Amino acid sequence: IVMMQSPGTLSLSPGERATLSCRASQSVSSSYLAWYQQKPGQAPRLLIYGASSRATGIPDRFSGSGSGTDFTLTISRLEPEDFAVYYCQQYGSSAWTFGQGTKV
Amino acid sequence: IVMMQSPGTLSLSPGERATLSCRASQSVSSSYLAWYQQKPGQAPRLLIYGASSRATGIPDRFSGSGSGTDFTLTISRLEPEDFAVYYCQQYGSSAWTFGQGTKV
Amino acid sequence: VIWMTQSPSSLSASVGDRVTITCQASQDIRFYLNWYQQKPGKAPKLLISDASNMETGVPSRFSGSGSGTDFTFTISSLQPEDIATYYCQQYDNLPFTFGPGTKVDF
Amino acid sequence: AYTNSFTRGVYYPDKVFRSSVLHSTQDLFLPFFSNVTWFHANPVLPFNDGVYFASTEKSNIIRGWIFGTTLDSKTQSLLIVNNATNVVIKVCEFQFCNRVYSSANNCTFEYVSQPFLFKNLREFVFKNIDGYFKIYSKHTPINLVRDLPQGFSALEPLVDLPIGINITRFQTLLAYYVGYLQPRTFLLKYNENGTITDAVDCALDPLSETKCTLKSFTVEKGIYQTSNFRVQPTESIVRFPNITNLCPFGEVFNA
Amino acid sequence: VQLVQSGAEVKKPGASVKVSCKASGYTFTGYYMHWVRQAPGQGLEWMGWINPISSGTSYAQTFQGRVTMTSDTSITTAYMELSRLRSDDTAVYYCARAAPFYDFWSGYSYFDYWGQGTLVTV
Amino acid sequence: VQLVQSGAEVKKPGASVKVSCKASGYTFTGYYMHWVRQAPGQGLEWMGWINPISSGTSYAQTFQGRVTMTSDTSITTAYMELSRLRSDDTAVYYCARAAPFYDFWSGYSYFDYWGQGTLVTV
Amino acid sequence: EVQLVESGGGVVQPGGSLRLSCAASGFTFNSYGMHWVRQAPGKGLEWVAFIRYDGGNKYYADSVKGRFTISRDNSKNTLYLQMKSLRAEDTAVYYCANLKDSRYSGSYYDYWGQGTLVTVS
Amino acid sequence: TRFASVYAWNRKRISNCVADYSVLYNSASFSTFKCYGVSPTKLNDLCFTNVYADSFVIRGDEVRQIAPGQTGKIADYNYKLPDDFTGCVIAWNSNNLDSKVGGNYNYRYRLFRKSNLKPFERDISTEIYQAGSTPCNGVEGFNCYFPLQSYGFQPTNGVGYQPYRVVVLSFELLHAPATVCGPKKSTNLVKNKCVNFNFNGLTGTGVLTESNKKFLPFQQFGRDIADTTDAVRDPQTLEILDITPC
Amino acid sequence: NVYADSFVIRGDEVRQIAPGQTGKIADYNYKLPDDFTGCVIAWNSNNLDSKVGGNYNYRYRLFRKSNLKPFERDISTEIYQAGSTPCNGVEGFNCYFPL
Ligand SMILES: *[C@@H]1O[C@H](CO[C@@H]2O[C@@H](C)[C@@H](O)[C@@H](O)[C@@H]2O)[C@@H](O[C@@H]2O[C@H](CO)[C@@H](O)[C@H](O)[C@H]2NC(C)=O)[C@H](O)[C@H]1NC(C)=O
Ligand SMILES: *[C@@H]1O[C@H](CO)[C@@H](O)[C@H](O)[C@H]1NC(C)=O
Ligand SMILES: *[C@@H]1O[C@H](CO)[C@@H](O)[C@H](O)[C@H]1NC(C)=O
Ligand SMILES: *[C@@H]1O[C@H](CO)[C@@H](O)[C@H](O)[C@H]1NC(C)=O
Ligand SMILES: *[C@@H]1O[C@H](CO)[C@@H](O)[C@H](O)[C@H]1NC(C)=O
Ligand SMILES: *[C@@H]1O[C@H](CO)[C@@H](O)[C@H](O)[C@H]1NC(C)=O
Ligand SMILES: *[C@@H]1O[C@H](CO)[C@@H](O)[C@H](O)[C@H]1NC(C)=O
């Protein structure tokens, strides 16, 4: 499988809304799609699991959605802290696969 | 209803015993009589509820008693901290009423 | 038991005036409200059912609407023959209840 | 206008095959020799606990039925409509006109099958139990003009629809007869092919109770005990002591 | 248990003031929130209560039509708003906690916890 | 939950490196430990997992025969060892936690906790 | 023409009893549930009781429950109300009615009688 | 994602499908799995006419109330099972989903009611409860209570005060065509010999033969006077078979 | 004769050590008969059996093909097949370690 994110880089002002995309080469169950956030100099942290469920301690400013081959992560109002790299992650056939990542 | 406290002001040395009074214009159930302490620059705190029961964290130096129209708060041995304003409080007929207060 | 309230308890209006009567339920009764018109010495007549459905024979000047707890009865242009006491009644559940009644006069 | 439905409106109470046996069952049946209303046309009628419907009109005269509560756009309603080739049954937020409806929002159920409808008398029974709308029917030849046919004919299950809605009123879509079902006890006679050929309404009269007590459709000469009578209480009377002081429970609890 | 109130306010006549009280350390909807007023050099006056679970309220006759109380369970906070302000509305305002009326041991009759008050000058 | 990893390492080609991850704040044997690699300027690659209760493992096809994973429950610590090192094995290595395969709500499909990574230069 | 005719009113003493009846005609009585509604002098309408079409299930207002009994005879097209332990507060004009109700009775028409006065004194 | 409050419990009707109950029973994820009127190991062998799945949230200490013959605020005023209940009660800790810092006040239960609920009765009204002899007229105050209360779930609560998600499966077994069956595979039909049989949930022993009994399309089986099935319709071929003892 | 059986479980599971019980312990670990004659004795051993970071020596069976018969003992560690596909002794998807 291949996980494809877009756009490679996004730029917008703080306080505005951002949307990031992730496309799969094949159908992915919604339960097997997750999103991670990685700030500079830090390990990745889980934001969304199961396509639409937030991880513990994550602000409701974040949400996710999608099915089949196409998924999307939404950031409603960006803070100075949200300008990080985001990844989508898929599970299937006894393997875990990450997208190439996008920089906000 | 009217709640009347006496004496308006009391003065005595530390280490001595003090008694304060509260008279009602009509009978008050013992369960509906309470006492509060207010130090300078502070909100009131509960000392006695239900006429004779101490609030949590209140020293056994304090006690209360009474029935019908006449109730009394006793301070067995005064500390420098006990020279505060005291109030009696009554409940009835869907309203809460305070006495005018007395200063120790 | 669902408590029914009406407002105003009484209103004065002239011929040609718009008359609005409010009925409120203490519980959500969906759209299960009847409106009745009663004149002295007579049994009540049904004007509106299911909150907003007009009865056959009822003049087009009568109307009503609402859902849940807040309902309104309206006469777009009061006529001389519309002088009566109006009641709202819920039939969402038993026991059934009527409101206080609103008296309309000149 | 009323007619006497002599012993009409009997249907197979369940899906169990029985033969050469007299079976006593409790269910909603049209009471024998009841007064059935004879309508000419088209008013909205109460559904009550179930409806017995019969007509001698052609299939292009009686089109079907509407079942529901407010029978408007505020609630779900059941619409059964026949045409030349099929029958269409739907449950939606229908807004009915006066070709039947102008709109049908929030549709939750749809079913399509074959048409439901000397002349030929058509009999239907409509029940609504635990969310299931049950329809029974029979089609027989008739040589009568002003009344219902005599003789016994049981109605078979036609369809069982998991609609899940409440029905309190209904209207016929366009002469016909309407009766209502009651909780009765019937003794049903199954022949060697498992067909119901007769029945006894156990509350019809002293003779019928004797027949039901006996599990037999014939009674020999004699005297038979069939039941017991008992006078029921007119009212309840309470006689306690007239003391008024309350028990001091609070004193135990708030020590 | 903690009750934390908003800071002091200064207003002119005819205006309205809103005081907040944030609660923590207990089940918010399990208690009534009362407001009590204290003018300079004076004693204590009860204004009314709000029940967060029902959003039901009751007010003292003195403030009927003048005061509105609200609450927001998502932030466990209660608010008191007093309109048509006058110079004699200058006082320290307190939020205080008491049991609901269904309390078997009459915990509704007294106030067991107080926030430190908010000074309002008109 | 905390995951604490060993410090950075510098190695030459053909050698082997071992990275440790100490877990605390949860039942160690109730979760799988996964390892994820990140080369400079690149994204994330999954290497394999170990199940401490059974000492069972599974690896990605890329590292099959190159990597070994072990664990020691007495110190709630997992280890990843990569042999026959090459210059393109330079990366930050992370340990991450996920549910076991018998998790009813598919908690195995994602990594819920991460250790701060260990930098390995070859 | 649809008619509902109440009868059996009159004057009784407190603690006494009175039985009302309502003769129905012009409609299929035995297909509809029926209600009793009362209106005290100078007061609004108050619902009293409801009976189903077979006479099987009966419902009462809390203010009369245990004192009033509702019944019907479908062979006589007649509705009955038996009132026991009558109080001064029970003085009212009593109506029999078929109230339009899309939830319970299933009636699509609304019928009322002229009403009969019951006085307790 | 979202579960109902217990006073406003959700119900889903399940029909016309294959039900594998072992995937639930053999799970490691459920703290409670209790069956009544049926054993969990036999569920996959059975056929039912309907299955209902009820779901809601309660606190841990209350899970014991979700059983036949129980009393307490939940059994009495919120969710009541029948005494002849047939079904399974499944529960698990949801502290990780349903609790929040400061308290989650979305989950509520009924605290006061005039009378106990009947089995499977639902009550979602919010009228004021009259505790005293004096009418409330819809106003909350002395002897006049708001009937509902919140749990206020917080992650630091003791286990008895943490949220639990509950699913109740009730099995409807009427004399009607079964629409929900376990995943048992069918075998070929064997006639004129003594065999054990299982026809859409109906088990027994005997010899099967072609029947001359004229079943109507709705009829699925016949019975004798001993309440024993003496004929069945085969669920796949719709053939009518006689059953006689070996 | 008298038999004395002994083991460690967690506090919430003590109720399962009785006749007519269900659950992971009663079902897969230690099962009493319904006509059992005997006594069940238990005490808290937090002071002996717990340690900082966790004592992982005490284990229980989580999965099994069928329930144990009364007084049956099972100490095998074979992979549990949850799915329709054989595991061949390998742990993974639908293939669990039983303890
Ligand atoms: C302790 O209880 C007594 C008895 O009151 C009863 O039980 C209580 C728990 C509560 O349910 C009351 O409403 C019951 O009446 C209390 O004495 C009664 O108080 C009420 C007013 O609250 C008064 O109307 C009654 O006349 C009193 N009864 C008697 C015999 O005097 C008493 O006040 C309680 N004391 C405390 C501190 O709670
Ligand atoms: C049917 O109605 C007639 C009056 O037309 C009446 O005499 C007869 O008793 C009624 N029969 C039944 C069963 O109601
Ligand atoms: C009867 O109704 C069905 C379903 O809408 C339709 O397909 C069919 O053409 C109709 N028959 C006629 C003669 O209109
Ligand atoms: C009807 O559909 C709307 C969505 O457009 C939905 O919100 C509403 O709840 C539905 N009502 C019913 C009775 O299904
Ligand atoms: C039963 O059906 C058979 C045909 O299978 C027929 O010959 C017989 O006459 C029927 N019995 C009766 C009483 O009609
Ligand atoms: C349908 O409505 C009637 C109204 O009398 C009610 O008694 C009955 O219980 C309702 N049926 C269901 C399944 O709710
Ligand atoms: C499945 O069962 C139906 C009857 O319910 C039958 O008509 C059909 O032929 C069967 N299919 C197969 C492959 O046997």
Side-chain angles (χ1 to χ4, degrees), chain A residues 1-10 14-15 17-22 24-59 61-76 78 80 82-102 104, chain B residues 1-10 14-15 17-22 24-59 61-76 78 80 82-102 104, chain C residues 8 13 16 23 25 40-41 43-44 51 57 59 64 66 68 80 84 88 95 99-101, chain D residues 1-14 16-56 60-61 64-72 74-80 83-84 86-87 89 91-92 94-96 100-104 106-107 115-117 121-127 131 133 135-141 147-162 164 166-167 169-243 245-250 252-255, chain E residues 1-8 10-11 13-86 88-122, chain F residues 1-8 10-11 13-86 88-122, chain G residues 8-10 14-16 22-24 26 33 40-42 44 49 55-56 61 66 88 92 96-97 106 113 115, chain H residues 1 3-174 176-184 186-246, chain I:
Chain A
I1 192 167
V2 179
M3 304 298 291
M4 182 67 74
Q5 296 179 228
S6 182
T9 304
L10 178 67
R17 181 170 65 87
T19 60
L20 303 173
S21 297
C22 181
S25 64
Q26 64 184 44
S27 295
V28 178
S29 298
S30 66
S31 67
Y32 294 154
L33 195 281
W35 290 89
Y36 293 92
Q37 181 187 60
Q38 183 172 37
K39 294 181 184 180
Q42 298 182 32
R45 70 173 184 156
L46 183 70
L47 268 58
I48 304 292
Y49 65 90
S52 65
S53 295
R54 288 187 296 276
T56 303
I58 304 301
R61 291 186 288 108
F62 293 90
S63 66
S65 63
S67 70
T69 59
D70 289 270
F71 300 88
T72 37
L73 175 69
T74 301
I75 305 172
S76 290
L78 275 74
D82 291 324
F83 296 89
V85 177
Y86 296 76
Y87 304 88
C88 64
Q89 180 255 309
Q90 169 268 359
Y91 168 81
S93 297
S94 302
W96 293 253
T97 298
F98 292 84
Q100 84 274 26
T102 62
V104 176
Chain B
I1 192 167
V2 179
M3 304 298 291
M4 182 67 74
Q5 296 179 228
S6 182
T9 303
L10 178 67
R17 181 170 65 87
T19 60
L20 303 173
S21 297
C22 181
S25 64
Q26 64 184 44
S27 295
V28 178
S29 298
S30 66
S31 67
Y32 294 154
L33 195 281
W35 290 89
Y36 293 92
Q37 181 187 60
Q38 183 172 37
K39 294 181 184 180
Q42 298 182 32
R45 70 173 184 156
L46 183 70
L47 268 58
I48 304 292
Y49 65 90
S52 65
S53 295
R54 288 187 296 276
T56 303
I58 304 301
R61 291 186 288 108
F62 293 90
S63 66
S65 63
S67 70
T69 59
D70 289 270
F71 300 88
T72 37
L73 175 68
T74 301
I75 305 172
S76 290
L78 275 74
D82 291 324
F83 296 89
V85 177
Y86 296 76
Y87 304 88
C88 64
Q89 180 255 309
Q90 169 268 359
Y91 168 81
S93 297
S94 302
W96 293 253
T97 298
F98 292 84
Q100 84 274 26
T102 62
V104 176
Chain C
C23 179
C88 62
Chain D
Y2 296 88
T3 189
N4 200 265
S5 67
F6 309 83
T7 51
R8 315 305 288 178
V10 176
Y11 63 90
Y12 292 83
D14 63 24
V16 178
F17 181 81
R18 299 180 183 82
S19 65
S20 299
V21 64
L22 310 184
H23 179 70
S24 176
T25 182
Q26 178 75 38
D27 214 333
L28 300 174
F29 294 106
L30 187 69
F32 290 173
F33 305 102
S34 69
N35 275 313
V36 176
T37 305
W38 188 13
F39 289 97
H40 298 85
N42 194 37
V44 176
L45 304 174
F47 186 78
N48 292 334
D49 295 319
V51 176
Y52 170 77
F53 182 93
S55 68
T56 60
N60 64 331
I61 296 170
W65 307 268
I66 298 168
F67 299 91
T69 51
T70 59
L71 305 176
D72 66 9
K74 292 183 171 78
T75 39
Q76 296 286 338
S77 294
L78 173 68
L79 174 65
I80 301 172
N83 76 21
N86 294 96
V87 61
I89 301 178
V91 180
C92 308
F94 289 112
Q95 176 63 62
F96 294 115
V100 174
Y101 59 84
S102 293
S103 71
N106 282 67
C107 290
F116 286 4
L117 285 85
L121 178 70
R122 300 185 173 85
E123 296 181 359
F124 295 88
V125 174
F126 301 100
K127 291 166 65 171
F133 193 74
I135 303 172
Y136 304 80
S137 71
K138 189 80 184 184
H139 304 264
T140 66
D147 268 285
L148 280 184
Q150 304 210 58
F152 178 108
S153 181
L155 275 62
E156 296 177 2
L158 180 62
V159 66
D160 190 337
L161 309 164
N166 204 266
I167 298 166
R169 329 201 291 198
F170 76 101
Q171 187 175 28
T172 303
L173 294 170
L174 305 175
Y176 55 88
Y177 305 90
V178 179
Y180 293 93
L181 306 180
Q182 294 182 350
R184 311 274 290 190
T185 301
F186 276 52
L187 180 67
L188 304 175
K189 180 175 181 180
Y190 291 84
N191 70 11
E192 58 269 28
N193 299 326
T195 296
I196 302 167
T197 63
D198 208 342
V200 178
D201 181 343
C202 299
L204 178 61
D205 52 44
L207 180 59
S208 288
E209 184 179 4
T210 298
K211 288 180 177 181
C212 290
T213 296
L214 295 185
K215 297 289 183 290
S216 180
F217 276 66
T218 40
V219 186
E220 296 294 323
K221 179 175 66 169
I223 182 166
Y224 304 91
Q225 185 175 4
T226 64
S227 66
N228 296 300
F229 63 86
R230 193 164 68 69
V231 174
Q232 301 299 304
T234 47
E235 54 197 323
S236 298
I237 76 165
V238 178
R239 306 290 291 173
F240 276 19
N242 58 13
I243 71 174
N245 57 302
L246 297 175
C247 293
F249 284 121
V252 175
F253 281 90
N254 71 10
Chain E
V1 177
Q2 296 285 278
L3 299 177
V4 178
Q5 297 182 218
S6 60
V10 180
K11 300 289 182 182
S16 296
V17 63
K18 182 183 287 185
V19 179
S20 68
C21 180
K22 184 177 180 179
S24 66
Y26 66 94
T27 304
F28 182 70
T29 59
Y31 299 88
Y32 288 8
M33 185 66 81
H34 292 255
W35 294 90
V36 177
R37 186 170 73 167
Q38 181 165 39
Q42 299 298 309
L44 302 171
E45 181 181 5
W46 171 80
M47 296 176 74
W49 60 259
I50 181 163
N51 181 12
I53 195 69
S54 63
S55 296
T57 63
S58 182
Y59 307 106
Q61 185 65 51
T62 300
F63 298 95
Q64 179 69 50
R66 287 199 61 206
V67 63
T68 300
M69 292 172 188
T70 67
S71 68
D72 184 349
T73 59
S74 76
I75 57 168
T76 60
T77 300
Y79 300 87
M80 187 279 288
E81 182 175 355
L82 180 64
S83 74
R84 299 183 180 177
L85 293 171
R86 297 180 292 170
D88 62 3
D89 289 316
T90 296
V92 176
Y93 292 75
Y94 305 92
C95 64
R97 194 190 81 167
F101 274 116
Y102 56 77
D103 188 80
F104 188 79
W105 297 279
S106 297
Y108 53 79
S109 72
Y110 63 90
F111 311 116
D112 57 3
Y113 294 92
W114 297 72
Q116 70 283 359
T118 300
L119 178 65
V120 178
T121 300
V122 180
Chain F
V1 177
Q2 296 285 278
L3 299 177
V4 178
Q5 297 182 218
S6 60
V10 180
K11 300 289 182 182
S16 296
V17 63
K18 182 183 287 185
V19 179
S20 68
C21 180
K22 184 177 180 179
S24 66
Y26 66 94
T27 304
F28 182 70
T29 59
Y31 299 88
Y32 288 8
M33 185 66 81
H34 292 255
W35 294 90
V36 177
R37 186 170 73 166
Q38 181 165 39
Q42 299 298 309
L44 302 171
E45 181 181 5
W46 171 80
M47 296 176 74
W49 60 259
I50 181 163
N51 181 12
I53 195 69
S54 63
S55 296
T57 63
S58 182
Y59 307 106
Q61 185 65 51
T62 300
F63 298 95
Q64 179 69 50
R66 287 199 61 206
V67 63
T68 300
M69 292 172 188
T70 67
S71 68
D72 184 349
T73 59
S74 76
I75 57 168
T76 60
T77 300
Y79 300 87
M80 187 279 288
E81 182 175 355
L82 181 64
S83 74
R84 299 183 180 177
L85 293 171
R86 297 180 292 170
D88 62 3
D89 289 316
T90 296
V92 176
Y93 292 75
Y94 305 92
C95 64
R97 194 190 81 167
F101 274 116
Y102 56 77
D103 188 80
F104 188 79
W105 297 279
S106 297
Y108 53 79
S109 72
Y110 63 90
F111 311 116
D112 57 3
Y113 294 92
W114 297 72
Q116 70 283 359
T118 300
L119 178 65
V120 178
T121 300
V122 180
Chain G
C22 177
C96 57
Chain H
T1 300
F3 267 52
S5 290
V6 70
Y7 83 91
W9 50 275
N10 287 335
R11 167 163 280 197
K12 182 176 177 66
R13 181 179 178 273
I14 298 168
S15 69
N16 297 308
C17 57
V18 178
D20 186 342
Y21 300 98
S22 73
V23 74
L24 296 172
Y25 192 71
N26 291 331
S27 171
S29 293
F30 303 120
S31 53
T32 297
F33 203 122
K34 295 182 180 180
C35 296
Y36 302 87
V38 65
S39 170
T41 60
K42 295 184 181 294
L43 289 169
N44 285 334
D45 295 314
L46 302 174
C47 290
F48 302 110
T49 64
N50 289 290
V51 180
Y52 291 98
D54 299 332
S55 63
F56 48 84
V57 176
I58 58 174
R59 70 185 183 89
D61 286 346
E62 297 179 309
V63 173
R64 55 141 285 256
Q65 290 183 46
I66 311 303
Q70 298 297 308
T71 63
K73 299 292 185 182
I74 300 300
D76 293 333
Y77 301 153
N78 291 272
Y79 184 82
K80 178 67 171 182
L81 296 176
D83 293 285
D84 56 338
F85 173 66
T86 302
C88 301
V89 179
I90 305 163
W92 64 100
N93 188 299
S94 57
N95 196 46
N96 62 308
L97 299 175
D98 291 322
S99 292
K100 70 185 284 296
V101 175
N104 183 1
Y105 296 92
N106 286 282
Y107 291 115
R108 297 191 301 176
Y109 62 96
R110 189 170 302 278
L111 184 59
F112 305 103
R113 198 174 192 268
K114 286 171 72 175
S115 62
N116 293 340
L117 294 174
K118 301 295 185 183
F120 300 124
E121 185 179 359
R122 196 162 169 275
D123 185 345
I124 59 166
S125 65
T126 56
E127 63 185 344
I128 298 297
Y129 178 76
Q130 183 183 320
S133 63
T134 299
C136 300
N137 297 330
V139 179
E140 185 178 12
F142 184 79
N143 288 334
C144 290
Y145 313 141
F146 185 75
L148 305 179
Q149 184 52 262
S150 293
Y151 288 105
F153 289 120
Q154 293 184 63
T156 61
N157 285 358
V159 295
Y161 298 94
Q162 292 181 8
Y164 279 70
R165 287 180 177 206
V166 179
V167 177
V168 180
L169 301 177
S170 60
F171 302 126
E172 181 178 293
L173 185 62
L174 302 175
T179 68
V180 180
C181 289
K184 190 179 286 294
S186 292
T187 67
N188 291 331
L189 182 68
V190 168
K191 291 181 270 184
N192 296 312
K193 274 182 295 165
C194 183
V195 297
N196 292 318
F197 55 79
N198 185 335
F199 291 96
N200 200 30
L202 177 66
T203 63
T205 304
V207 179
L208 304 173
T209 67
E210 295 86 357
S211 173
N212 292 329
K213 292 179 180 180
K214 302 294 183 182
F215 279 34
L216 298 173
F218 67 87
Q219 296 179 307
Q220 301 298 304
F221 61 77
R223 293 181 185 272
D224 68 10
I225 64 168
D227 204 37
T228 299
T229 303
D230 68 5
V232 296
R233 184 189 297 277
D234 184 285
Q236 294 178 29
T237 65
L238 305 177
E239 183 175 302
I240 306 302
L241 302 172
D242 285 331
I243 302 170
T244 63
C246 303
Chain I
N1 289 290
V2 180
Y3 291 98
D5 299 332
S6 63
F7 48 84
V8 176
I9 58 174
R10 70 185 183 89
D12 286 346
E13 297 179 309
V14 173
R15 55 141 285 256
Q16 290 183 46
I17 311 303
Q21 298 297 308
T22 63
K24 299 292 185 182
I25 300 300
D27 293 333
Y28 301 153
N29 291 272
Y30 184 82
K31 178 67 171 182
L32 296 176
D34 293 285
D35 56 338
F36 173 66
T37 302
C39 301
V40 179
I41 305 163
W43 64 100
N44 188 299
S45 57
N46 196 46
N47 62 308
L48 299 175
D49 291 322
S50 292
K51 70 185 284 296
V52 175
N55 183 1
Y56 296 92
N57 286 282
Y58 291 115
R59 297 191 301 176
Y60 62 96
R61 189 170 302 278
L62 184 59
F63 305 103
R64 198 174 192 268
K65 286 171 72 175
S66 62
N67 293 340
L68 294 174
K69 301 295 185 183
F71 300 124
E72 185 179 359
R73 196 162 169 275
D74 185 345
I75 59 166
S76 65
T77 56
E78 63 185 343
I79 298 297
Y80 178 76
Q81 183 183 320
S84 63
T85 299
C87 300
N88 297 330
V90 179
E91 185 178 12
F93 184 79
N94 288 334
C95 290
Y96 313 141
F97 185 75
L99 305 179

